[PDB]
Amino acid sequence: NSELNTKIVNRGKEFFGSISGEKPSLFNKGAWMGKAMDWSMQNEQFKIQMFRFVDVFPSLTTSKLLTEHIREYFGGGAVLNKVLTSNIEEMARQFIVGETTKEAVKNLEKLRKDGFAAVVDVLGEATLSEEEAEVYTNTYLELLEALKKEQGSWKGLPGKGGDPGLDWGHAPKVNIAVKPTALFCLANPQDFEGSVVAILDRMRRIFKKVMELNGFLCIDMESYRHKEIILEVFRRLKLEYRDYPHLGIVLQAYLKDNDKDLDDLLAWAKEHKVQISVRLVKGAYWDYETVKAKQNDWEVPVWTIKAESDAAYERQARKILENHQICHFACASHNIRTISAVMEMARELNVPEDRYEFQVLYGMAEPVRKGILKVAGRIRLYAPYGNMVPGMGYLVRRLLENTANESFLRQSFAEDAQIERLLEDPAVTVERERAARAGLGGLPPFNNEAMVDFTRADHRAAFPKHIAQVRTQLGKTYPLFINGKEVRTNDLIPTVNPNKPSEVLGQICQAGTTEVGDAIAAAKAAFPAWRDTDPRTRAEYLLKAAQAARKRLFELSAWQVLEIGKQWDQAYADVTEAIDFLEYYAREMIRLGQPQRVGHAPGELNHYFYEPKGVAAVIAPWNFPLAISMGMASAAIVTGNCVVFKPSGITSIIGWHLVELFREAGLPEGVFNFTPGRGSVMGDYLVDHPDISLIAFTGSMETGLRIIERAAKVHPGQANVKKIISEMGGKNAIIIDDDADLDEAVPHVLYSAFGFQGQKCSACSRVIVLDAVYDKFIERLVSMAKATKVGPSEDPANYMGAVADDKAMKSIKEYAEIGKREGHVLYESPVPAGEGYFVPMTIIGGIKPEHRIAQEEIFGPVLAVMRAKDFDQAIEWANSTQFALTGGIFSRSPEHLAKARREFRVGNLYINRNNTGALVERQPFGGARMSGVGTKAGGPDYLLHFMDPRVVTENTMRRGFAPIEEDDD
Amino acid sequence: SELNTKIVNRGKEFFGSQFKIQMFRFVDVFPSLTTSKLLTEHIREYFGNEQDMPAFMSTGAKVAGMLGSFGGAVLNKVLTSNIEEMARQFIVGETTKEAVKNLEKLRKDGFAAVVDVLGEATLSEEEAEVYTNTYLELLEALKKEQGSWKGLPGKGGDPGLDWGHAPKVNIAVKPTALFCLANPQDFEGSVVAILDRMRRIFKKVMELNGFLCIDMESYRHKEIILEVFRRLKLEYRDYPHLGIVLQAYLKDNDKDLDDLLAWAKEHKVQISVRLVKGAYWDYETVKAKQNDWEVPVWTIKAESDAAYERQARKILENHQICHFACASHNIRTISAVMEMARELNVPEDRYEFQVLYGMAEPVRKGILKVAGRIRLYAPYGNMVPGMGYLERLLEDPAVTVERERAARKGLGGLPPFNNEAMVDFTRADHRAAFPKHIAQVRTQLGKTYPLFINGKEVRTNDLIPTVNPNKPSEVLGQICQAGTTEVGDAIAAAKAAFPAWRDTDPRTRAEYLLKAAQAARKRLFELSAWQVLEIGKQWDQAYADVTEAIDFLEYYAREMIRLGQPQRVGHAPGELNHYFYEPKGVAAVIAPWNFPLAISMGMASAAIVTGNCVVFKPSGITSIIGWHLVELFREAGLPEGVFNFTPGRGSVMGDYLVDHPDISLIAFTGSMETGLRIIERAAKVHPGQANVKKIISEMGGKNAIIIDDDADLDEAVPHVLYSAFGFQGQKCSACSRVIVLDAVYDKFIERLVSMAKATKVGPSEDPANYMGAVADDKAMKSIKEYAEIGKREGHVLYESPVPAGEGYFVPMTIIGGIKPEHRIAQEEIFGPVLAVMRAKDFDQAIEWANSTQFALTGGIFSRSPEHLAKARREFRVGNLYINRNNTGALVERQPFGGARMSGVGTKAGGPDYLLHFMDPRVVTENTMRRGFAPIEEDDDW
Ligand SMILES: Cc1cc2nc3c(=O)[nH]c(=O)nc-3n(C[C@H](O)[C@H](O)[C@H](O)COP(=O)(O)OP(=O)(O)OC[C@H]3O[C@@H](n4cnc5c(N)ncnc54)[C@H](O)[C@@H]3O)c2cc1C
Ligand SMILES: Cc1cc2nc3c(=O)[nH]c(=O)nc-3n(C[C@H](O)[C@H](O)[C@H](O)COP(=O)(O)OP(=O)(O)OC[C@H]3O[C@@H](n4cnc5c(N)ncnc54)[C@H](O)[C@@H]3O)c2cc1C
Ligand SMILES: [K+]
Ligand SMILES: [K+]
C-alpha cells in the first residue's frame, strides 16, 4: 500500500537523520576490532584468513603454535603473546556480557540502568555428549537461580502504565533463550522422534524453573536440519503448559518454508486455543545453508536474493501483528527499513504495545538501538555469556553478519549511505532483481542424484512404509539370468537379515560351472553385435536403467536395510551412487566414443579410438551391494563388453536388482548375465575361463591377489591378456593435529569408524592423535560414543547395527580380542540381547604400528587409537601399513596440510571431514599399494580400463593429389 | 616496360588466333575392373549417392548392382569402347603402326612431335626391359619411315629436316622407368643402372640422327637425373641432340641452370633444355611436410611463372651453347619466351615450342599460326590403362609476385611437438655423412662397456662381445654383464633415488628429457652409424630409429607437462577436490634389439619423466646402443640412481629382475613367449613388495596386408615389399602375410616376385643392398627352419641369393599357397619370410586377416569405399594402414600397440601412454569453517 510505504520511508528517513555520523562500536577504527573488520571488508582473502585465525586461536596454546600460525595465515615474546591474545579476546568480548553467570548478571543489571531489557543466552550449540548437555542445562538452572534472587530488587523498565513490577508495565523481567542442539548430541531428523523427546525433556526441566519465577523462555532456531524438530518441541512444551503465556519460538524469514510455517503455527494456536510468541528474525546461517545444501545434494532452503528475505520479513511481521491477540511479537532486526516497517504496520493495525517489542544483538547497531529506545521505549538485548570456544560458532556468525556485502549495517556505517535505496519497499526490490536475474549428446551436464532429506515429512514416512512393503515380498526364489532368460537350479541359499537372522528374505539359485559356462557363452555370442552398437545407443541403455532405479529409489533402499543391515541414509546413498555411476558412465562413453584425429601431417589421416575387450567377469562385494555392483557392471557394459556378474552370496537379492533394472532398460540378451554361485563351486572357474578378457573385482586383498595371479595365465584359446580392475580394501587413518577443531573431528571420526558398522573399504580404523590434544580428544570421542546406540538398522535411532553375517562377526570378535590384548579398551558398547550379528562399538587405545590391529583390515566397528608424539610421527604412522586407500586429517595449519597433501599418500585424502562417502565425479575413488591397481571408479580415467585403443591411418594422396583437411600443416 | 608491352601484344595476338570427382575416380580404377562383378560393384558404389548424382547415373548404378555380374558384359563393352575413344584424344596410338599413322597425320598438319611411352610404373628389371625395348621398337619403325618424310616448312636450311634444322625423330624418356629401385640413398647405383639403359636407347637415336630428351621427375631423383645427363653428354660430346628437362618451380633451378651452363662451357659442349614448370607440386609439398624436409618448390604460383621467364631468358642469352624447348600451355609464358628471343636476336634453330598432343585441336593450330615451330608431346601405349593415368592473365608475373607476397601454437612456453626431420638423401651432406660416421665408429671399436649404477660405472668379470651381424668376425666391443648382486644394487640405487625424484617438479623432469633430446640430435649421424654396424640397420632404418628416440623424448616431455598439473574435479561449493598423478617406484625396462634406441628410450624416458626410477636391461646383442641411453642421460645431468644400466644374461638375472619385490612396474617389448612369462611372474606379490606390479608389454604380431582386387598395383607392390623385407622383416609391425584377392592374384604375384628379384641382399652399410643379415646366429637358424617348414607347407615363389662368406644371411623368401591352418600363417618368424595367401573373396580376406592370435598392425590396398569401411571396422588391429605400408609408425601420428596376444593395450607415442606409469590420487578439502567457505570461481553457486 502506497500510503503505508510512504510513512515507513519517512520514518526511516527521520531515523537515519537522527543517527547521522554515528557508527556501531564494532566499526571504531581506534580499536583493533575496527581495523580488522575494515581490512576484512576491503579484502576477501584477508577476511577469510582473519576469520579462520579467530577460529583456530583458542587451540594455539604455545608460543610456537601462535607464531607459526600467524606466519602461515598472514605471512619479550611473552608480552607479544599477550598483545595478540588480548586482541582476539577483545573481538569475542565485543558480543558477550560475560564469561560466568555471576559476571553476566552484574552486566545484565548495568544494562537495565541504561534502559535495556535482556534475553540471556548460555553460549553453546551442537553439543557432543550427554554430560555436556547436562552442564549446559545446569548452567541455565544456575542462571535462573541467580536471577530469581535479584529480580525482586529490580524496578520495572519505564512504561506507560500497567504493573510497575514488570518491564514497561507488562513484560516479565527474566527472559532467557535456549538453543535446542545444545540439549542433545545426536539431534537428527533421521531419528525425528528421539531427537524431539531428548531435547524436549531437558527443555522442560529448564522451562519449569522459568515458570517458577514467572519468566519468559524463547526457543532459538538453528540450522534448517533441525527446524522441524524444534517446531515440534515448542508445540509439545506449549501444550503441556497451555495457560502459561511466556513461551516463544524463533521463525526465520530467510526460509522459503516460513510463509507456510507461520500460517501453520497461527492456525495451530487457534485450533488448540492457546497464545504464542514469535521472535521473527531473518536468519543467522545463510552462508552455511547455501553451501550445505549444494554439498549434500539437497534443495536450498533459504531465499538467495537478500531483498526476498527483507520482503518476507515485512510480509510475515504484518501477518503476526494482524494476529496480535493470539501471537505476541518480538521484532528482531538491526535494519532501519525493517524496523520502521514494523512500527508503521503496528500503528496502522492499532496494535497494543504490550503485544510487540524490539530486539537487537548485544554489541551491535548501537545507534539503531538508541533510536528504538527513544521512539518505542521497548528494546531488549540478546545477551550471550560463556567462553570463547563454546561461543566460537556465535562469534563467527557475528563477524560474517557485520561484514557481509549484503549487510544493512555495513551499507549504512561502513559504506556511504544511499538512504533512498536502503529504505525502498523490499517487495519492489524483489521484482526488479528477480526480473534482472532473468553438455554434449544433447544431455544436461552430470549432477549427483538428490540425497534423501529427512527434514521432509514424506521422506521420513517413506522408509517405514517401504520396509513394510518389502516384508510383503519375502520368500521368493531368485533364479539365474542368462541370455535374457530366467534359469532355475536346485541348489538354493537363503538370504537373511543380519539384524534378525531368523527372518529369511528369500532363496537364491546357485550357478554350477555348467551354468556359468552357459553365461560366458551367451555373453560371448552377444559380444559382436553389442561391440558394434553405437556408443550413444549403449549410453542410452544406462540412462534408462538409471531412470528405472530412480522410480524405485525408496523400495531399492529398503531392501538393503533388511538384506545387509544398511541404515536408512546408508541404504539410500548406495542406490543414488548406483544411479550416479549410470549417469556418469553414460556421459563418459559419449565423450570417449568419438574417434579423434591425431597428428596434423597433410596427405594422411590418423584416427585414434577405443574398442571393448570381450566378456567381463564382475565379482561384487556385499558392502555396497548395488552401488559398486552397478558401477563395475555398467562401466563394462557401456564400453561395449558383455558381463557375467557374481553378486556376493549374502546380498544376492540386491544383485537381482541389477537384473531388474537392465531388464526394464531392455538391454539385449546376453549382454548382462546374473550368476550367483558358491565360490567353492565356480569362483576359480569364472576367473580361469579362456573366454574372459576382463575381471572387475572389489573385495579383500587376499582374494584380489589370488584373482590377479590366476588371471595372469593365458590358457589355450584365450584371446586376450586378462585386464584386472581390482579394489582391495584399506587400513585407513585419520590424523588429529594439535590445532584440530575437536568439535568437528569427533563426530566425523565417529562416523568414519562406525558408519555402517565400519564395513567400508574407506572406513577409519586408525585414529592417530597428537599427544598434545590426546586426553581432550579421547574424552570427547568416548563421551559421544557412549551416547550412541547399537541395534537394528531399520530403527533410525540406532547409530550402527549388526555386521554382515555370522562369519564376519566371529572374525571381527577375534580381532577385537587381539586388540584388547595389544592395547587397552577405551569404550565397548552394550549390544542388544537375543539374535543378530552384533559386535559392540569398540574403541581401543595404546595401539602402535607394530600391533596387528594397526595393520590388518578388520572391516568392523573396532577403532584403534594411536598416540603420536608429533606431526612427523603422525604422518609416518599413517603411512606404516601396506594399504593406501583413504585417509583424513584434521588440521588448521597450512604447512601441515601441505605436508599431508604431499606425504600422506593415499588414493583419497580428506581434509577436515570424514574419510568415507566418496561421490561420483567429485571424489573418483580408489588407490594403489595393496589397496588396488590404480583404477578410480567414478572418474574420468575409469572407462578406458575397459577398452583398448586402435588407430586407423589412411594415405589420402592418390595420384599426386591429396585433399586438404582443416587441421593440416 | 618495353618487352612487357611487346609480350602483352604477342599474347593478344595469340588469344585471337561431386559428380566430376566420382567420374575421375572411376576412370582411374577402371583398368583394374577385370571382371563383370568388379565392374558392376564399382559402378554401384561410385555412382550410388542418390543425392549427389544425376538421376541417370544414380538409377544406372542401382541397376548395375541388382544385375550383378549378369549385367557386366554389356557395361564393359560400352564403357571400354567409350573410354578407348576418349583416350584416343590424348594418346597417339598403342601400336607403332597406329602411332606412325597419326604421327604422319600430325606432320601433314604443321606439327613436329616428341614421343613418350605411357605405361605402368617400372617395378622390375623385366619391366624396365619392356619399356626400353618399346623405345628401340619405335626407333626401328621410325628409322624405316623418316626417309619418306617431307620436312616441315621453313625459312632456309635442309628441307629434309624439320624447319630446316630439327631432327624428324624426337623421343622423350622417363629415367625412373629404366630402374625400379632408383633412389638417392643409392645415388651411384641408380645413376649407373639408368645410364646403362639410357645409353642403349641413345645409340639407336644417334644411329638415325634423332633427338633424345631426358624427362625430369620428382625432386627425389633430380640430382640422379642431372648426373645421368652429364655422364651421357660427355660420352658423346659432339652429338648435339641430347636434351634435359628443367623445372622452374624448384628453388634449386636457378643454381642448377647456372651450374649446367657453366659445366657445358667448361667442357666445351652444347646442350638442350626443355624448360617446364613442374608436374609434382602437390606431391612435393605434402612429402616435404610429412618429413620436415625443406619444401623444394615455390608456393606462390606466380613465383613459378616468374622463375620460368627469368630462366628462359638466361637460356636464350646463352643460345650458342644451349638449345631451348618451351613447354607450357600458358599464353603469357609462350609469348614472353617468343619476344625475349626476338629481342635478343636468337636464331630460330635455337628455340622451339612444345605442347601436349591432347591440347584442343583449334588451340593447337591457332598457336602454330603464330609461333611457327610447334612440337607435340605424344604419349604412346595402352589406351584404357593410359587414360586411367590421365588481361590479368598477361601481366608480368614478377609484378604478381611482389603483390601476392606482400599480402601474406605451443604450451608450457614450449613449441608444439613436431616429429624430427627424416634424413634426406637428396642432400649431398646427408649422403656423405654415413660412410664418414661408419668409419669413425670403426675407430672406436674394442672398448669395454661397464654397468652404470647410481651415477657410477661398475665393471664385472663377465664380458659378452657384441659383433656385426653382417660380418660377425668384426667385434665392436665387450659388454660387462650384471649378476643378480649388481641388479640388486641397481634396484636399491633406484629405490633410494625415488623419493627425491618423485618430488621433483614435473616440468623439471621434462626438462631433463628435452636436454637428452638435444644431446641425441647433436649426435644423430653418429648414433645412427652405430646401429648400422651393431644390428644391421640400413641407413634410413638407423636414422629413423634415432629420430624416433628423439621424438619420444620431445613428446613425453610435453605429455608430462600436460599431465603434471592437478585438476579440480566437481563443482560443489565449500569443497575442493583435486585429481592428479604420482609415480609408482622402480621400473624394470627390458628392451629388444630390433629398435635398440627408439623403443629403449621410449620406455625408459616415459618411466623417468613420470617420476619413476629405472633399471634398464638392453638386449644382449645391442648393448652398445643401450649404452647410448647412458651417455644421453649423463649429458642431460640426470640425478644419480634415476637411470641404471644393467645388461645381463637373461638366464642369470632375468627372473631376478622381474621377481624383485622392489619393482613396481615392468616395461617390456619382445616376444610373446617372454612377455607372457613376465606377466605370470609379475602377478605374484612377494613379502615386502609395495605395489601390484604394473605391466607394459608389447609382444609382436603376424601382420597381414590385404590386396583387394581393385588395388593400385604400382603402389601396393613396393609397399608390400618394404613392409615384408625392410630391415630383413625384423619388426613387430612387419608384413608377414600378404592376403591377395583371387582376381588380381596372378598379376600381383608376378610383379611382386619380379621386384624382389631386382633387389640385392648384403651388408647394410652398403646402401645399394635392400636388406641384409638377420640379428644373430640363433635368429638365422630359427628363421631358416621356418623357411623349410613354409616351403613344405606351400610353394616357394622366390628365394634370393645371399653373399658367400660370413654373415647371418637369410634369403629374401616368398612362399605361396599359404592358408590359415599353416604354421607360417600363424607363428611369428621375425625374418625375411613372406607368406602369400590367395583369398577367394573380400569376406574371406578379412576372416583370414583375423585368423591369428596376434593383432598388432595390418594394411589394406583397395579403392572400394565399402571394402575400406569393412576393414576399418572388422580388421581389428592396433594400427591399420590404408593404401600404404603397415610399418614405420611415427610418434603422435601413429600411437603404436595392440591387444590380443600382441600387447596389453598400451600405445607408445600417444596421449594415453604416460598414465600407465602412474597412479591417480585425489585430495578433498572441506573449506567450510564455522559456517563459511571461500567462494571459488568454478563453484556452482
Ligand atoms: C535478538 C536477535 C535474535 C536472533 N535470533 C536468531 C535465531 O535464534 N536463529 C537465527 O537463524 N537467526 C536469529 N537472528 C537473526 C540473525 O542472527 C541476524 O541478526 C539477522 O538475520 C540480521 O538481519 P537484519 O534485519 O539485522 O540485517 P540485514 O543486513 O537486514 O539482514 C541480513 C540478513 O539477510 C539474510 N540474507 C543475507 N544475504 C541473503 C541473500 N543473498 N539471500 C537471501 N537472504 C539473505 C540473512 O538472514 C542475513 O542475516 C536473531 C537476530 C536478533 C537481533
Ligand atoms: C611438352 C611438355 C613436356 C613436359 N615435361 C615434363 C617433365 O619431363 N617433368 C615435369 O616435372 N613436368 C613436365 N611437364 C609439365 C609441366 O611441368 C607442367 O606441369 C605444366 O606443363 C604446366 O602447365 P602450364 O605452363 O601450361 O600452365 P600453368 O597454369 O601455367 O602452370 C601450372 C604450373 O604452375 C605450378 N604451380 C601451380 N601452383 C603453384 C603454386 N601454388 N606455387 C608454385 N608453383 C605452382 C605447377 O608447376 C603447375 O604445373 C611437361 C609439359 C609439357 C607440355
Ligand atoms: K543377507
Ligand atoms: K651385435
PDB file of N, CA and C and ligand atoms in Angstrom, chain B residues 114 214-217 245 247 249 274 276-281 297-305 327-330 333 354-356 375 377, ligand 2:
ATOM      1  N   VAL B 114      57.366 -35.084 -80.293  1.00  0.00           N
ATOM      2  CA  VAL B 114      58.211 -35.850 -79.387  1.00  0.00           C
ATOM      3  C   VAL B 114      57.349 -36.975 -78.810  1.00  0.00           C
ATOM      4  N   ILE B 214      65.624 -36.192 -72.005  1.00  0.00           N
ATOM      5  CA  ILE B 214      65.503 -36.897 -70.740  1.00  0.00           C
ATOM      6  C   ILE B 214      64.539 -36.150 -69.824  1.00  0.00           C
ATOM      7  N   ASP B 215      63.377 -36.748 -69.558  1.00  0.00           N
ATOM      8  CA  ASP B 215      62.369 -36.124 -68.696  1.00  0.00           C
ATOM      9  C   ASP B 215      62.886 -35.903 -67.282  1.00  0.00           C
ATOM     10  N   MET B 216      62.272 -34.958 -66.573  1.00  0.00           N
ATOM     11  CA  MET B 216      62.580 -34.745 -65.166  1.00  0.00           C
ATOM     12  C   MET B 216      61.381 -35.169 -64.320  1.00  0.00           C
ATOM     13  N   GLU B 217      61.642 -35.914 -63.254  1.00  0.00           N
ATOM     14  CA  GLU B 217      60.573 -36.437 -62.413  1.00  0.00           C
ATOM     15  C   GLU B 217      60.585 -35.747 -61.048  1.00  0.00           C
ATOM     16  N   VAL B 245      65.204 -31.982 -69.198  1.00  0.00           N
ATOM     17  CA  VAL B 245      64.111 -31.172 -68.678  1.00  0.00           C
ATOM     18  C   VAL B 245      64.531 -30.478 -67.382  1.00  0.00           C
ATOM     19  N   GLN B 247      62.906 -27.911 -64.258  1.00  0.00           N
ATOM     20  CA  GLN B 247      61.639 -27.449 -63.701  1.00  0.00           C
ATOM     21  C   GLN B 247      61.784 -26.109 -62.994  1.00  0.00           C
ATOM     22  N   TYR B 249      59.667 -24.577 -61.112  1.00  0.00           N
ATOM     23  CA  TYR B 249      59.041 -24.476 -59.790  1.00  0.00           C
ATOM     24  C   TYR B 249      59.993 -24.816 -58.646  1.00  0.00           C
ATOM     25  N   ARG B 274      64.681 -28.556 -72.156  1.00  0.00           N
ATOM     26  CA  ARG B 274      63.240 -28.359 -72.213  1.00  0.00           C
ATOM     27  C   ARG B 274      62.791 -27.812 -70.870  1.00  0.00           C
ATOM     28  N   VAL B 276      60.255 -26.654 -68.209  1.00  0.00           N
ATOM     29  CA  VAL B 276      58.865 -26.812 -67.807  1.00  0.00           C
ATOM     30  C   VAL B 276      58.647 -26.102 -66.482  1.00  0.00           C
ATOM     31  N   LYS B 277      57.402 -26.065 -66.024  1.00  0.00           N
ATOM     32  CA  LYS B 277      57.122 -25.516 -64.708  1.00  0.00           C
ATOM     33  C   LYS B 277      57.295 -26.570 -63.622  1.00  0.00           C
ATOM     34  N   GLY B 278      56.707 -27.743 -63.831  1.00  0.00           N
ATOM     35  CA  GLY B 278      56.828 -28.830 -62.876  1.00  0.00           C
ATOM     36  C   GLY B 278      55.497 -29.522 -62.674  1.00  0.00           C
ATOM     37  N   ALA B 279      55.520 -30.854 -62.667  1.00  0.00           N
ATOM     38  CA  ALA B 279      54.295 -31.654 -62.630  1.00  0.00           C
ATOM     39  C   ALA B 279      53.951 -32.251 -61.263  1.00  0.00           C
ATOM     40  N   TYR B 280      54.810 -32.047 -60.268  1.00  0.00           N
ATOM     41  CA  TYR B 280      54.642 -32.727 -58.982  1.00  0.00           C
ATOM     42  C   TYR B 280      54.453 -31.796 -57.791  1.00  0.00           C
ATOM     43  N   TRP B 281      53.830 -30.645 -58.018  1.00  0.00           N
ATOM     44  CA  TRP B 281      53.726 -29.626 -56.979  1.00  0.00           C
ATOM     45  C   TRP B 281      53.083 -30.122 -55.683  1.00  0.00           C
ATOM     46  N   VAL B 297      59.793 -26.611 -53.768  1.00  0.00           N
ATOM     47  CA  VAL B 297      59.106 -25.765 -54.742  1.00  0.00           C
ATOM     48  C   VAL B 297      58.675 -24.430 -54.140  1.00  0.00           C
ATOM     49  N   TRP B 298      58.497 -23.416 -54.991  1.00  0.00           N
ATOM     50  CA  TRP B 298      57.831 -22.184 -54.577  1.00  0.00           C
ATOM     51  C   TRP B 298      56.395 -22.540 -54.244  1.00  0.00           C
ATOM     52  N   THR B 299      55.735 -21.718 -53.431  1.00  0.00           N
ATOM     53  CA  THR B 299      54.349 -21.995 -53.050  1.00  0.00           C
ATOM     54  C   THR B 299      53.382 -20.889 -53.478  1.00  0.00           C
ATOM     55  N   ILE B 300      53.914 -19.901 -54.199  1.00  0.00           N
ATOM     56  CA  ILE B 300      53.099 -18.918 -54.905  1.00  0.00           C
ATOM     57  C   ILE B 300      53.209 -19.230 -56.388  1.00  0.00           C
ATOM     58  N   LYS B 301      52.079 -19.524 -57.028  1.00  0.00           N
ATOM     59  CA  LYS B 301      52.074 -19.946 -58.429  1.00  0.00           C
ATOM     60  C   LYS B 301      52.839 -18.975 -59.330  1.00  0.00           C
ATOM     61  N   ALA B 302      52.624 -17.682 -59.119  1.00  0.00           N
ATOM     62  CA  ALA B 302      53.295 -16.644 -59.894  1.00  0.00           C
ATOM     63  C   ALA B 302      54.820 -16.749 -59.817  1.00  0.00           C
ATOM     64  N   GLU B 303      55.335 -17.170 -58.661  1.00  0.00           N
ATOM     65  CA  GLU B 303      56.778 -17.347 -58.489  1.00  0.00           C
ATOM     66  C   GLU B 303      57.342 -18.339 -59.509  1.00  0.00           C
ATOM     67  N   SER B 304      56.562 -19.371 -59.823  1.00  0.00           N
ATOM     68  CA  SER B 304      56.931 -20.321 -60.867  1.00  0.00           C
ATOM     69  C   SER B 304      56.798 -19.707 -62.261  1.00  0.00           C
ATOM     70  N   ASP B 305      55.749 -18.911 -62.466  1.00  0.00           N
ATOM     71  CA  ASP B 305      55.559 -18.210 -63.736  1.00  0.00           C
ATOM     72  C   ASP B 305      56.640 -17.161 -63.938  1.00  0.00           C
ATOM     73  N   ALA B 327      58.042 -25.534 -73.071  1.00  0.00           N
ATOM     74  CA  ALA B 327      56.962 -26.488 -72.835  1.00  0.00           C
ATOM     75  C   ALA B 327      55.973 -25.948 -71.815  1.00  0.00           C
ATOM     76  N   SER B 328      54.920 -25.311 -72.316  1.00  0.00           N
ATOM     77  CA  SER B 328      53.874 -24.731 -71.481  1.00  0.00           C
ATOM     78  C   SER B 328      52.621 -24.530 -72.317  1.00  0.00           C
ATOM     79  N   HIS B 329      51.470 -24.492 -71.653  1.00  0.00           N
ATOM     80  CA  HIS B 329      50.224 -24.169 -72.332  1.00  0.00           C
ATOM     81  C   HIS B 329      49.809 -22.753 -71.963  1.00  0.00           C
ATOM     82  N   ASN B 330      50.675 -22.069 -71.221  1.00  0.00           N
ATOM     83  CA  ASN B 330      50.403 -20.694 -70.834  1.00  0.00           C
ATOM     84  C   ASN B 330      50.799 -19.703 -71.923  1.00  0.00           C
ATOM     85  N   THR B 333      53.478 -17.235 -70.943  1.00  0.00           N
ATOM     86  CA  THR B 333      54.781 -17.880 -70.879  1.00  0.00           C
ATOM     87  C   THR B 333      55.380 -18.076 -72.272  1.00  0.00           C
ATOM     88  N   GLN B 354      56.699 -26.530 -77.423  1.00  0.00           N
ATOM     89  CA  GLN B 354      56.130 -27.847 -77.201  1.00  0.00           C
ATOM     90  C   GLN B 354      54.848 -27.777 -76.380  1.00  0.00           C
ATOM     91  N   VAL B 355      53.829 -28.492 -76.847  1.00  0.00           N
ATOM     92  CA  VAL B 355      52.546 -28.571 -76.159  1.00  0.00           C
ATOM     93  C   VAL B 355      52.040 -30.009 -76.189  1.00  0.00           C
ATOM     94  N   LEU B 356      51.043 -30.306 -75.362  1.00  0.00           N
ATOM     95  CA  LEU B 356      50.506 -31.663 -75.275  1.00  0.00           C
ATOM     96  C   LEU B 356      49.665 -32.040 -76.492  1.00  0.00           C
ATOM     97  N   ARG B 375      56.149 -28.521 -81.455  1.00  0.00           N
ATOM     98  CA  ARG B 375      56.345 -29.958 -81.317  1.00  0.00           C
ATOM     99  C   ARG B 375      55.306 -30.514 -80.347  1.00  0.00           C
ATOM    100  N   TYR B 377      53.950 -33.187 -77.721  1.00  0.00           N
ATOM    101  CA  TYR B 377      54.291 -34.239 -76.782  1.00  0.00           C
ATOM    102  C   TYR B 377      53.253 -35.344 -76.905  1.00  0.00           C
TER     103      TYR B 377
HETATM  104  C1  LIG C   2      55.573 -30.845 -73.687  1.00  0.00           C
HETATM  105  C2  LIG C   2      55.580 -30.930 -72.178  1.00  0.00           C
HETATM  106  C3  LIG C   2      56.576 -31.650 -71.522  1.00  0.00           C
HETATM  107  C4  LIG C   2      56.586 -31.727 -70.114  1.00  0.00           C
HETATM  108  N1  LIG C   2      57.585 -32.452 -69.455  1.00  0.00           N
HETATM  109  C5  LIG C   2      57.605 -32.541 -68.063  1.00  0.00           C
HETATM  110  C6  LIG C   2      58.672 -33.282 -67.325  1.00  0.00           C
HETATM  111  O1  LIG C   2      59.579 -34.059 -68.005  1.00  0.00           O
HETATM  112  N2  LIG C   2      58.792 -33.146 -65.963  1.00  0.00           N
HETATM  113  C7  LIG C   2      57.875 -32.407 -65.249  1.00  0.00           C
HETATM  114  O2  LIG C   2      58.045 -32.258 -63.908  1.00  0.00           O
HETATM  115  N3  LIG C   2      56.660 -31.959 -65.891  1.00  0.00           N
HETATM  116  C8  LIG C   2      56.598 -31.878 -67.279  1.00  0.00           C
HETATM  117  N4  LIG C   2      55.589 -31.149 -67.947  1.00  0.00           N
HETATM  118  C9  LIG C   2      54.526 -30.485 -67.173  1.00  0.00           C
HETATM  119  C10 LIG C   2      54.913 -29.101 -66.723  1.00  0.00           C
HETATM  120  O3  LIG C   2      55.954 -29.158 -65.837  1.00  0.00           O
HETATM  121  C11 LIG C   2      53.697 -28.521 -66.022  1.00  0.00           C
HETATM  122  O4  LIG C   2      53.114 -29.496 -65.250  1.00  0.00           O
HETATM  123  C12 LIG C   2      52.644 -27.968 -66.952  1.00  0.00           C
HETATM  124  O5  LIG C   2      53.030 -28.068 -68.267  1.00  0.00           O
HETATM  125  C13 LIG C   2      52.433 -26.513 -66.591  1.00  0.00           C
HETATM  126  O6  LIG C   2      51.325 -26.033 -67.298  1.00  0.00           O
HETATM  127  P1  LIG C   2      51.372 -24.535 -67.835  1.00  0.00           P
HETATM  128  O7  LIG C   2      52.744 -23.780 -68.017  1.00  0.00           O
HETATM  129  O8  LIG C   2      50.555 -24.880 -69.136  1.00  0.00           O
HETATM  130  O9  LIG C   2      50.096 -23.857 -67.094  1.00  0.00           O
HETATM  131  P2  LIG C   2      50.058 -23.149 -65.793  1.00  0.00           P
HETATM  132  O10 LIG C   2      48.671 -22.927 -65.131  1.00  0.00           O
HETATM  133  O11 LIG C   2      50.810 -22.000 -66.233  1.00  0.00           O
HETATM  134  O12 LIG C   2      51.132 -23.769 -64.992  1.00  0.00           O
HETATM  135  C14 LIG C   2      50.793 -24.534 -63.846  1.00  0.00           C
HETATM  136  C15 LIG C   2      52.042 -24.893 -63.046  1.00  0.00           C
HETATM  137  O13 LIG C   2      52.334 -23.947 -62.061  1.00  0.00           O
HETATM  138  C16 LIG C   2      52.947 -24.605 -60.981  1.00  0.00           C
HETATM  139  N5  LIG C   2      52.227 -24.253 -59.777  1.00  0.00           N
HETATM  140  C17 LIG C   2      50.887 -24.464 -59.511  1.00  0.00           C
HETATM  141  N6  LIG C   2      50.582 -23.989 -58.301  1.00  0.00           N
HETATM  142  C18 LIG C   2      51.714 -23.436 -57.724  1.00  0.00           C
HETATM  143  C19 LIG C   2      51.985 -22.816 -56.516  1.00  0.00           C
HETATM  144  N7  LIG C   2      50.944 -22.629 -55.534  1.00  0.00           N
HETATM  145  N8  LIG C   2      53.231 -22.379 -56.258  1.00  0.00           N
HETATM  146  C20 LIG C   2      54.240 -22.533 -57.151  1.00  0.00           C
HETATM  147  N9  LIG C   2      54.002 -23.140 -58.340  1.00  0.00           N
HETATM  148  C21 LIG C   2      52.776 -23.594 -58.652  1.00  0.00           C
HETATM  149  C22 LIG C   2      52.961 -26.060 -61.273  1.00  0.00           C
HETATM  150  O14 LIG C   2      54.203 -26.438 -61.724  1.00  0.00           O
HETATM  151  C23 LIG C   2      51.929 -26.194 -62.322  1.00  0.00           C
HETATM  152  O15 LIG C   2      52.206 -27.295 -63.098  1.00  0.00           O
HETATM  153  C24 LIG C   2      55.586 -31.077 -69.384  1.00  0.00           C
HETATM  154  C25 LIG C   2      54.594 -30.361 -70.053  1.00  0.00           C
HETATM  155  C26 LIG C   2      54.595 -30.287 -71.453  1.00  0.00           C
HETATM  156  C27 LIG C   2      53.528 -29.517 -72.171  1.00  0.00           C
END
